[PDB]
Short mmCIF file of C-alpha atoms and ligand atoms in Angstrom, two decimals:
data_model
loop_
_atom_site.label_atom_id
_atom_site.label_comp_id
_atom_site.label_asym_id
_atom_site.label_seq_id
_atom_site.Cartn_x
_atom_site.Cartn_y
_atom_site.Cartn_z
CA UNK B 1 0.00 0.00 0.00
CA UNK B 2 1.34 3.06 -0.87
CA UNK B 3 2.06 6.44 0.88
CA UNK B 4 -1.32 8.78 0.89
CA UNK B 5 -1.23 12.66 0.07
CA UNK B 6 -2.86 14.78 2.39
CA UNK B 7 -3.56 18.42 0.59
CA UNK B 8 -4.58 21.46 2.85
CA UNK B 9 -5.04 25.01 1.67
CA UNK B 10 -5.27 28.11 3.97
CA UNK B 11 -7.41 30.16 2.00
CA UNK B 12 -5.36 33.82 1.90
CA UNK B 13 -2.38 32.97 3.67
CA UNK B 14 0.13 35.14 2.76
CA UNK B 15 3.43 33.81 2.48
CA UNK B 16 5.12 35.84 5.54
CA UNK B 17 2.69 35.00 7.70
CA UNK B 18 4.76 31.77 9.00
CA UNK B 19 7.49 34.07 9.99
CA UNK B 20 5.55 36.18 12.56
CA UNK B 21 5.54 33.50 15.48
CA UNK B 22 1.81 32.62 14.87
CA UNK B 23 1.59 29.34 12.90
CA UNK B 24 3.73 26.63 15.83
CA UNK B 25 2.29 23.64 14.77
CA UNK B 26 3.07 25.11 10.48
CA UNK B 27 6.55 26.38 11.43
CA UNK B 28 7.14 22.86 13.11
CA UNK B 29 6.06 21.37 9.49
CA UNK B 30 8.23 23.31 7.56
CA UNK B 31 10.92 22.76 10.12
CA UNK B 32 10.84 19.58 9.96
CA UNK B 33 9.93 18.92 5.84
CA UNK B 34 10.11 21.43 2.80
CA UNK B 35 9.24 25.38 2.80
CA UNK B 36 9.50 27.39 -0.24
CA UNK B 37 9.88 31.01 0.21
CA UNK B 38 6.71 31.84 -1.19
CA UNK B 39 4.35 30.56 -4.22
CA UNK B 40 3.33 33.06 -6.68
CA UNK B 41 -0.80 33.07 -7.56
CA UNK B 42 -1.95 32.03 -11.09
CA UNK B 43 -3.58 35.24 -12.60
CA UNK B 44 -6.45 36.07 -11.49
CA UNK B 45 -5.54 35.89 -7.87
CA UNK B 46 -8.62 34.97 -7.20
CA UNK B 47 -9.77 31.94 -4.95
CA UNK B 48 -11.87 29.43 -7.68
CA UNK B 49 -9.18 30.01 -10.38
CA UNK B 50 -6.46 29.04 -8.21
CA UNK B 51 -7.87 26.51 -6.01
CA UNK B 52 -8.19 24.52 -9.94
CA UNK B 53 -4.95 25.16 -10.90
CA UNK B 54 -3.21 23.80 -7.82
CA UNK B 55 -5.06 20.60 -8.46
CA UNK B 56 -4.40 21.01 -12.50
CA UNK B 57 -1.19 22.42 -12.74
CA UNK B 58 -2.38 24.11 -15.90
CA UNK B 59 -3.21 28.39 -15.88
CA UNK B 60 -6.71 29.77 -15.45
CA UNK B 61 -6.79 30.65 -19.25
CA UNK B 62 -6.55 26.87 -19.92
CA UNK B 63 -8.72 25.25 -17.02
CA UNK B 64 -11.63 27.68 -18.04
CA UNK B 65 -12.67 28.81 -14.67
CA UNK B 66 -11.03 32.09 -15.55
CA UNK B 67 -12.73 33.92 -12.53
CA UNK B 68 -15.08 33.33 -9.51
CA UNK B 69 -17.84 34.74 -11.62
CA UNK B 70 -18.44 33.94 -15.53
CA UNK B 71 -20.81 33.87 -18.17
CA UNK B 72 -20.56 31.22 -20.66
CA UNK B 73 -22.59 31.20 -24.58
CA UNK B 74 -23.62 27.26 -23.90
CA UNK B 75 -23.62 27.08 -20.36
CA UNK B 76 -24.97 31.04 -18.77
CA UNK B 77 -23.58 32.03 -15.74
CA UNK B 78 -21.11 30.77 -13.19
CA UNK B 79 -20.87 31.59 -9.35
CA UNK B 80 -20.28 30.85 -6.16
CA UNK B 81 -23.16 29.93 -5.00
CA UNK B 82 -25.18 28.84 -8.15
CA UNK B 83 -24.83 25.40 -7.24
CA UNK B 84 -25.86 23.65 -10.83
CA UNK B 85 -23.49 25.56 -12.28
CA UNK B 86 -20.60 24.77 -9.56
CA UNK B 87 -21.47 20.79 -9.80
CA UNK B 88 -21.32 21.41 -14.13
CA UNK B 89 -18.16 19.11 -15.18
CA UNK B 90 -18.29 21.16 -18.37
CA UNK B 91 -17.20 24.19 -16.69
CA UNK B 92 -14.06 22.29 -15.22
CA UNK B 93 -11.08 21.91 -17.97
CA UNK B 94 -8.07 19.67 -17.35
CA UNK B 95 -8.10 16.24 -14.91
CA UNK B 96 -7.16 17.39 -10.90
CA UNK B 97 -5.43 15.26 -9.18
CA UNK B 98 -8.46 13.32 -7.45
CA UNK B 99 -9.48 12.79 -11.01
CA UNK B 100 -6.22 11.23 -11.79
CA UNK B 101 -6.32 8.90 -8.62
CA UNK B 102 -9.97 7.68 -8.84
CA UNK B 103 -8.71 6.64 -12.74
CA UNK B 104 -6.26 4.22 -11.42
CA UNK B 105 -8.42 1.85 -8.85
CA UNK B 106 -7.43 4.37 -5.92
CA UNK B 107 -9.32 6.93 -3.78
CA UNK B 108 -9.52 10.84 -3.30
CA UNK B 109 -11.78 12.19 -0.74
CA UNK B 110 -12.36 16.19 -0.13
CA UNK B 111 -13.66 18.43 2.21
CA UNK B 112 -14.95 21.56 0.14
CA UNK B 113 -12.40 21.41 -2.40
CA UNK B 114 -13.20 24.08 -5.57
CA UNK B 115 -14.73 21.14 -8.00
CA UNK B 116 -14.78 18.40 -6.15
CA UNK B 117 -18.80 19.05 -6.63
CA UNK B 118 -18.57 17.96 -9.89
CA UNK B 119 -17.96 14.48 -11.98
CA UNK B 120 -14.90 16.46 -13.69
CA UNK B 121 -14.31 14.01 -16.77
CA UNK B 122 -17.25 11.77 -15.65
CA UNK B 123 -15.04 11.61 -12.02
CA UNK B 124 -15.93 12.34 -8.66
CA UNK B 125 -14.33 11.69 -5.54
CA UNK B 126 -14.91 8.76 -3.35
CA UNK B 127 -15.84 11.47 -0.63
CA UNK B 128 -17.10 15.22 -1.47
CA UNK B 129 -19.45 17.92 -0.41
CA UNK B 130 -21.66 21.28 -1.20
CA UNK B 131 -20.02 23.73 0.48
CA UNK B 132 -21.77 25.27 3.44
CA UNK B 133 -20.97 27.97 5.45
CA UNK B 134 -19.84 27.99 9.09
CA UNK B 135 -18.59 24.82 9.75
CA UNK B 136 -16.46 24.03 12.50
CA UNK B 137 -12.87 23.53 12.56
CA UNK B 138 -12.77 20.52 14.57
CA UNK B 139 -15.52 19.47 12.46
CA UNK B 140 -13.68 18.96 9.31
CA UNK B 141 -10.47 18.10 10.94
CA UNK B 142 -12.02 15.24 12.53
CA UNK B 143 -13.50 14.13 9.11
CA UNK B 144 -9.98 14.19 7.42
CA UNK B 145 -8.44 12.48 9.74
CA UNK B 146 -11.50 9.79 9.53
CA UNK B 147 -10.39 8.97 5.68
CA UNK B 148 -6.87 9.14 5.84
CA UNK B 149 -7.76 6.12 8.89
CA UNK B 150 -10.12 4.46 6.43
CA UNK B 151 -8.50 0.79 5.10
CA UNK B 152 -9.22 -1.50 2.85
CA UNK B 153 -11.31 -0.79 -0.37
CA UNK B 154 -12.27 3.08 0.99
CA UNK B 155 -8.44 3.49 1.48
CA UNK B 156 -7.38 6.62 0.66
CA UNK B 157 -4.97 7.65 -1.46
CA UNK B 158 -5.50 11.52 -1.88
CA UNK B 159 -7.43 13.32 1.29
CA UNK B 160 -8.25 17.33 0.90
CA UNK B 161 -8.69 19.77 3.44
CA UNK B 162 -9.91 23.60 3.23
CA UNK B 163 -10.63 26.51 5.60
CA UNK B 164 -11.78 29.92 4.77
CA UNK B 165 -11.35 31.14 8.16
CA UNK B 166 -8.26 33.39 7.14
CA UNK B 167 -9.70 34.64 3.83
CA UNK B 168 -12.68 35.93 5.38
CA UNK B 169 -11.06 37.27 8.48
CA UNK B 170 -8.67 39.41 6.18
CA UNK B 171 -11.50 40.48 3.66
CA UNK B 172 -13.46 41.60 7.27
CA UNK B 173 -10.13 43.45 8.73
CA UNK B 174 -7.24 43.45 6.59
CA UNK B 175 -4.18 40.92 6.84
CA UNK B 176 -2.10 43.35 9.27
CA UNK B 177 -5.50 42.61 11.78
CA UNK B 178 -5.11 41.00 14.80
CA UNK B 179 -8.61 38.98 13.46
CA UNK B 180 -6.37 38.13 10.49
CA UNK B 181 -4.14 36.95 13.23
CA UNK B 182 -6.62 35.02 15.22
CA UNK B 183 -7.88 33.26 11.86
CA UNK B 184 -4.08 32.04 11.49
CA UNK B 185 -3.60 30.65 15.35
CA UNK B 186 -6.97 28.76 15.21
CA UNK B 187 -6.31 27.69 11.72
CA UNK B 188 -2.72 26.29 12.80
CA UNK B 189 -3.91 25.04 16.17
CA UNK B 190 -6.60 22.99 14.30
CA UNK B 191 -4.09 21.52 12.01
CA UNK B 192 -2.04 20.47 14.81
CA UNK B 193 -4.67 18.71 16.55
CA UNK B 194 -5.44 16.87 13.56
CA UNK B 195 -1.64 16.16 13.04
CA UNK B 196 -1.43 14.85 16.45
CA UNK B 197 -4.82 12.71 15.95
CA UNK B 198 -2.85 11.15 12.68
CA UNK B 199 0.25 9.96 14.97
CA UNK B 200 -1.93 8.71 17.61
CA UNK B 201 -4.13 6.64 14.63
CA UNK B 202 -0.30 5.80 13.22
CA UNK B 203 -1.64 7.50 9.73
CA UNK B 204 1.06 10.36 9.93
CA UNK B 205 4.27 8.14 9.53
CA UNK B 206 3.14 7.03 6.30
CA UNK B 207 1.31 10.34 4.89
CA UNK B 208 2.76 12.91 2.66
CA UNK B 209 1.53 16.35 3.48
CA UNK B 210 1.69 19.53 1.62
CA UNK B 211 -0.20 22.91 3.06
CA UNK B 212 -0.71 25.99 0.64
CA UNK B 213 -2.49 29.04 -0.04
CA UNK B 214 -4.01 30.18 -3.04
CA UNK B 215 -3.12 33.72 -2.76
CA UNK B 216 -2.42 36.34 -0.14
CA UNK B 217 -4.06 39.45 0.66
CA UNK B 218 -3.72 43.47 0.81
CA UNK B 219 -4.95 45.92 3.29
CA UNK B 220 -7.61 47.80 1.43
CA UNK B 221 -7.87 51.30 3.59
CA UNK B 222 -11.11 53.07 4.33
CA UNK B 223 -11.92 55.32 1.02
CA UNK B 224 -10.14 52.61 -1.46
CA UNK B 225 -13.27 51.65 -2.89
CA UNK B 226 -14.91 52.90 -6.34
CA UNK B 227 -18.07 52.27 -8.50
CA UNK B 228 -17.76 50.00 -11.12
CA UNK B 229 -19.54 52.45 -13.22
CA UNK B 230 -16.66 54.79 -12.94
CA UNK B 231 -14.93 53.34 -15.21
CA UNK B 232 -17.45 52.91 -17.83
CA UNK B 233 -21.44 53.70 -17.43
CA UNK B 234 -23.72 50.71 -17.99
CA UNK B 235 -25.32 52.39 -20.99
CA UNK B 236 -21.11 51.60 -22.88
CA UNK B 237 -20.61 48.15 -21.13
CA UNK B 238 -21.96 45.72 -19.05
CA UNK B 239 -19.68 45.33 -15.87
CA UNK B 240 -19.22 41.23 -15.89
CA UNK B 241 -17.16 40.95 -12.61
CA UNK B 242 -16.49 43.25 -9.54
CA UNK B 243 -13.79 43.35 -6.87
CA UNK B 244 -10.38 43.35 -8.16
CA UNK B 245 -10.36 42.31 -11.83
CA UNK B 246 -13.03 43.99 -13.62
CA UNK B 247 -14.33 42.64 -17.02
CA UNK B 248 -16.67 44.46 -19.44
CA UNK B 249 -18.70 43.56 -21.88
CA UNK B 250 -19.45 46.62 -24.60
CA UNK B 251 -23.18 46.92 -25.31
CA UNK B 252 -23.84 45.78 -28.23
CA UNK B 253 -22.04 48.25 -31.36
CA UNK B 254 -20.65 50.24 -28.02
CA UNK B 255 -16.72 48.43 -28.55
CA UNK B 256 -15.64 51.86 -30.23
CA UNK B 257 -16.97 54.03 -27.08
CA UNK B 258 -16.35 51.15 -24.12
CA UNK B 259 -12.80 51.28 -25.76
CA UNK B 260 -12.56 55.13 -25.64
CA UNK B 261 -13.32 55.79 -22.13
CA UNK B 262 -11.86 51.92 -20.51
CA UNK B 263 -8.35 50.86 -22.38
CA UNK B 264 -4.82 52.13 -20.96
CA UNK B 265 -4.12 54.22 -17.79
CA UNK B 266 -6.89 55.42 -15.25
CA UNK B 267 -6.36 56.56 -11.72
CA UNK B 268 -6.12 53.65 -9.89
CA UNK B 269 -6.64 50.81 -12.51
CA UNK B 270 -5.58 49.84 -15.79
CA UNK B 271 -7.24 48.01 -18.73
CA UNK B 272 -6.52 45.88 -21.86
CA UNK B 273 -8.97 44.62 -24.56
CA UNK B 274 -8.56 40.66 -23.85
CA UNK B 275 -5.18 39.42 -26.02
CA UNK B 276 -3.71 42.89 -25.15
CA UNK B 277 -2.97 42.02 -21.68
CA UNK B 278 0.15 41.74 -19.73
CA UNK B 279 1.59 38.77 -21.35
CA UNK B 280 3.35 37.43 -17.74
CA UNK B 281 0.07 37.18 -16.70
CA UNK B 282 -0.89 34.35 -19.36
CA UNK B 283 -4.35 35.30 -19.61
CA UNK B 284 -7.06 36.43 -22.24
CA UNK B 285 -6.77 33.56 -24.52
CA UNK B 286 -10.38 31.62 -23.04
CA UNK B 287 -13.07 32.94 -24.83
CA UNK B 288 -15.18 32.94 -21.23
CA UNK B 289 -12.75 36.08 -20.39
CA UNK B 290 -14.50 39.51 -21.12
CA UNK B 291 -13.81 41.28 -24.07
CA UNK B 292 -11.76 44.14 -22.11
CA UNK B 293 -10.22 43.21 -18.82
CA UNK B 294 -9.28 46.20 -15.77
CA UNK B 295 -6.92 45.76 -12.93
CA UNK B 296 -7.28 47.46 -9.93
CA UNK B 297 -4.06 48.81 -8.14
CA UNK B 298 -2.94 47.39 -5.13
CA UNK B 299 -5.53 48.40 -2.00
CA UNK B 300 -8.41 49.65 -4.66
CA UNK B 301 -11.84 47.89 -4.69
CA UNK B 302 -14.38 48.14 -7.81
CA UNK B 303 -17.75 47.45 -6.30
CA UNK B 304 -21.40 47.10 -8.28
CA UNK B 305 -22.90 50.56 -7.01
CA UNK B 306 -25.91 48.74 -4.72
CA UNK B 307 -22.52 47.10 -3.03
CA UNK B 308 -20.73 50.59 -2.75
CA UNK B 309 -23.68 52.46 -0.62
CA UNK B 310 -24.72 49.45 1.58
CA UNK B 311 -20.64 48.77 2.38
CA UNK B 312 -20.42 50.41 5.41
CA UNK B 313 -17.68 53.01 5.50
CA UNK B 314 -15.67 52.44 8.68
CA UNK B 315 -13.00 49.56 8.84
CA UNK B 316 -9.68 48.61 7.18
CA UNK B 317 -10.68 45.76 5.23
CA UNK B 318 -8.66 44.05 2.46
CA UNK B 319 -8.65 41.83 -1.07
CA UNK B 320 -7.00 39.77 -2.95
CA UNK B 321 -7.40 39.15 -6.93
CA UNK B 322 -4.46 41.81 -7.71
CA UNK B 323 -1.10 41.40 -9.81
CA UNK B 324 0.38 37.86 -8.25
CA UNK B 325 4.04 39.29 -8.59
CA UNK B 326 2.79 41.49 -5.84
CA UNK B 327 4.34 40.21 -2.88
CA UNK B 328 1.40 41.10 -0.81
CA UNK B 329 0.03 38.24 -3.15
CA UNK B 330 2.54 35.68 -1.92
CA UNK B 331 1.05 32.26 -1.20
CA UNK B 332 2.67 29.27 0.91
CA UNK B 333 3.53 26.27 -0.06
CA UNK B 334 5.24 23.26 2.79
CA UNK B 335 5.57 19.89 2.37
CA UNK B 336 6.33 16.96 5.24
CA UNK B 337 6.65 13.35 4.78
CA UNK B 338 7.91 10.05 4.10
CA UNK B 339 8.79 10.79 0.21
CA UNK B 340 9.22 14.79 0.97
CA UNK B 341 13.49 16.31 2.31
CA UNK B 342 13.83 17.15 5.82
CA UNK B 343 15.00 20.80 6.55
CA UNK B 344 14.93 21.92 3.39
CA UNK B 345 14.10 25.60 1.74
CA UNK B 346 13.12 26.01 -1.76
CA UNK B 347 13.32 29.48 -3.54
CA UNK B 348 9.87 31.62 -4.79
CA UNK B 349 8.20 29.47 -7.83
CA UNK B 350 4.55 29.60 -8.98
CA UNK B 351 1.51 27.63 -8.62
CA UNK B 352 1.45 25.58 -11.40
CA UNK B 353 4.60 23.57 -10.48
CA UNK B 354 2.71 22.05 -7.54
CA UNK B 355 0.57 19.48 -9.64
CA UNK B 356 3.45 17.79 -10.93
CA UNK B 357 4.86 16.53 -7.35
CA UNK B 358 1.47 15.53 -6.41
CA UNK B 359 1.35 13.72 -9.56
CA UNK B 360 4.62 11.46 -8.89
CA UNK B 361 3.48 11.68 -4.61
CA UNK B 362 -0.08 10.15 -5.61
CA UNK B 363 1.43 7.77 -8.70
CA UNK B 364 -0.42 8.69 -11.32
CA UNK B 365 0.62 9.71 -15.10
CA UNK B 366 0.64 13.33 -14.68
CA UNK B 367 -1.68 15.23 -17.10
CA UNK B 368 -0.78 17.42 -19.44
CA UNK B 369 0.20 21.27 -17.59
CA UNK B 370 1.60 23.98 -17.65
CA UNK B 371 4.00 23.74 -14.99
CA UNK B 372 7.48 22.53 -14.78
CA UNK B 373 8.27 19.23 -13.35
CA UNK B 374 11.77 20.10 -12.82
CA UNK B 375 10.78 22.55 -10.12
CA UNK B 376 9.90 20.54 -7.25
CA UNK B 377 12.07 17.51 -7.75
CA UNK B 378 14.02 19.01 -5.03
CA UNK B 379 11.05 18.93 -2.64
CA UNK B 380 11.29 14.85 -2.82
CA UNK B 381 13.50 13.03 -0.04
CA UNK B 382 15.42 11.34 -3.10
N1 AMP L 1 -16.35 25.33 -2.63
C1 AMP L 1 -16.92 26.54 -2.41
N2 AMP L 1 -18.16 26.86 -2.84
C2 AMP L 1 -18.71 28.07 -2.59
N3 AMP L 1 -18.07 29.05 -1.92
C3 AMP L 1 -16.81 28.88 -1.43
C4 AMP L 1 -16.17 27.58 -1.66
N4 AMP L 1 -14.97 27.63 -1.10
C5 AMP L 1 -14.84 28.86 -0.55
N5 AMP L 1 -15.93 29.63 -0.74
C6 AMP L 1 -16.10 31.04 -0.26
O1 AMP L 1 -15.93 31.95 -1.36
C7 AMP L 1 -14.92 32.94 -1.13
C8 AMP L 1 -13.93 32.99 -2.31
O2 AMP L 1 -13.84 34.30 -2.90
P1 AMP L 1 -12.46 35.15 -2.95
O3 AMP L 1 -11.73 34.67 -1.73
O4 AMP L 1 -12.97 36.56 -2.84
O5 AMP L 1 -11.80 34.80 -4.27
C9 AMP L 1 -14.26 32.60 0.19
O6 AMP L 1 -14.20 33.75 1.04
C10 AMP L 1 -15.08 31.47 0.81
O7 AMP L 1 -15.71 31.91 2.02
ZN1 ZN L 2 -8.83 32.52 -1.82
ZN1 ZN L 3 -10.92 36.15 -0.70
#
């Protein structure tokens, strides 16, 4: 029987945040296993996007979910909480990792994993959920550590975890917040427990682990916040996305004048008609993207107006879903295990590279991606 995988993302953990004497049980982990430096988003930096390409190894442009929120000609709209859409295999591009495992007699089982609601190539998980808010940490922890225990034919080869904890407290108060802080501890003190819980079942000697993030986060300062329709009035363009990266649609015959008033420099965002974009950022290729894309600047929020009265104007908040060279964009990425070096640090590399250790730590034929398997070699033990 072979060694299982057990993948857990921190949703927003920026990639300092394990030097700032906050994250024991974490700092322990990388201690004792594999740390790189950071782990640069996918673009957008965005939570669906990434989640996917973590599990993919292949850029939002090629995976199709190109942003939390979408429109698509065959298949209409795509959100968070449209939960046909969500459990639609045809949204999801590529084969993830649980994909690859369930392919080859062996079995994946996640806890709120971004689609793992969905039978991505006819394939879904031996375990999986809908989402739900609000559910405890001990809660899920518990259930992990149930299916990595689980033997014979609902043995485990792959096991997921997720917690959104640390997102949400840094959206609330900003990632400099002592909530942002608390998010971290209890986050890290739950992962712990169920690290402790695995040597006491005898399941941790034999698991590989590997924690990231799928971005990090900004402070976004009282007053950083703008209407979408500032940058171009719903009569020009239809504003497809809020937040961080804004996409338009031009009414129909309206290109010429959405063009006029959107593309190039703007106070505190920037635009590009689709293939015009930033080439690093290896996106505006999928025909789901918007016909003109906007970035907002570091700290600077684009909200749908009905969002920008009711948002009440008080607190530091913050955001992610801006440039991922940004360091404040920085995700983690540790690894601990039987097959995984002891003590070792591993410079800044991106997301994508992640799929292709998983791949070789889960023994499966990796998929096709756009990563490099040369990166993470150095992660393995031999
Ligand atoms: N599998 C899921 N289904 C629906 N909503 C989710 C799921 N996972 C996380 N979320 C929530 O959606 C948000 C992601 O948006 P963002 O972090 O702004 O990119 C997080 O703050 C979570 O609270
Ligand atoms: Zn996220
Ligand atoms: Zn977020």
């Amino acid at each position: 029987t072979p060694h299982a995988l057990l993948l857990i993302s921190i949703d927003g953990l920026r990639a300092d945040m394990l030097d700032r004497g906050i994250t024991p049980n974490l700092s322990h982990l990388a201690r004792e296993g594999v740390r790189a430096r950071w782990m640069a988003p996918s673009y957008p930096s965005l939570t669906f996007p990434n989640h996917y390409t973590l599990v993919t190894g292949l850029r939002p442009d090629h995976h199709g979910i190109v942003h939390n929120s979408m429109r698509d000609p065959t298949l209409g709209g795509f959100w968070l909480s449209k939960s046909e859409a969500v459990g639609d295999a045809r949204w999801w591009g590529g084969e993830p990792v649980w994909v690859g495992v369930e392919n080859t007699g062996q079995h994946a089982a996640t806890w709120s994993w971004p689609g793992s609601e969905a039978a991505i190539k006819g394939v879904r998980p031996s375990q999986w959920r809908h989402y739900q808010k609000g559910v405890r940490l001990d809660t899920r922890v518990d259930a992990v550590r149930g299916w990595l225990a689980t033997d014979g034919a609902q043995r485990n080869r792959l096991v997921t975890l997720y917690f959104e904890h640390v997102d949400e407290a840094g959206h609330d108060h900003g990632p400099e917040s002592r909530q942002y802080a608390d998010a971290v501890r209890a986050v890290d003190a739950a992962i712990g427990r169920l690290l402790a819980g695995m040597q006491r079942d005898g399941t941790r000697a034999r698991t590989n682990i590997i924690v990231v993030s799928d971005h990090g986060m900004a402070e976004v300062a009282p007053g950083h916040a703008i209407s979408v329709e500032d940058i171009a009035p719903p009569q020009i363009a239809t504003a497809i996305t809020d937040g961080q990266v804004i996409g338009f649609e031009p009414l129909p015959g309206q290109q010429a004048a959405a063009e006029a008033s959107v593309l190039g420099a703007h106070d505190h965002y920037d635009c590009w008609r689709k293939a015009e974009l930033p080439a690093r950022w290896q996106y505006g290729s999928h025909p789901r993207i918007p016909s003109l894309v906007c970035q907002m600047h570091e700290g600077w929020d684009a909200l749908f107006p009905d969002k920008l009265a009711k948002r009440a104007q008080r607190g530091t908040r913050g955001s992610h879903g801006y440039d991922p060279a940004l360091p404040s964009m920085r995700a983690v990425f540790l690894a601990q295990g039987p097959d995984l070096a002891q003590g070792k640090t591993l410079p800044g590399f991106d997301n994508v590279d992640v799929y292709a250790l998983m791949s070789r730590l889960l023994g499966i034929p990796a998929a096709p991606n756009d990563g490099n398997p040369a990166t993470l070699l150095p992660a393995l033990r031999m």
